[PDB]
Amino acid sequence: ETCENVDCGPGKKCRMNKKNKPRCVCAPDCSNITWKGPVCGLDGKTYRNECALLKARCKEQPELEVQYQGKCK
Secondary structure (H helix, E strand, O other), X not given: OOOOOOOOOOOEEEEEOOOOOEEEEEOOOOOOOOXXXXXXXXXXXXXXXXXXXXXXXXXXXXXXXXXXXXXXX
8 A cells, every 4th residue: 555665676766656556666767878869669659758768668569679770660
């Protein structure tokens, strides 16, 4: 019933939802990133930046990566 003493692991952080229940939500660390502009994902969708691609990777697509820098065609 609280975020205290709850370890979500790497890439996740605990957060209380609208029901006062602690949940592990995707909170990827993006400090290691080099290119800071938009990136084209292996799903063919552009992401405003890699940080966002990592969030989506963690939330829905495990095999998602950057297939090239810049916007997708």
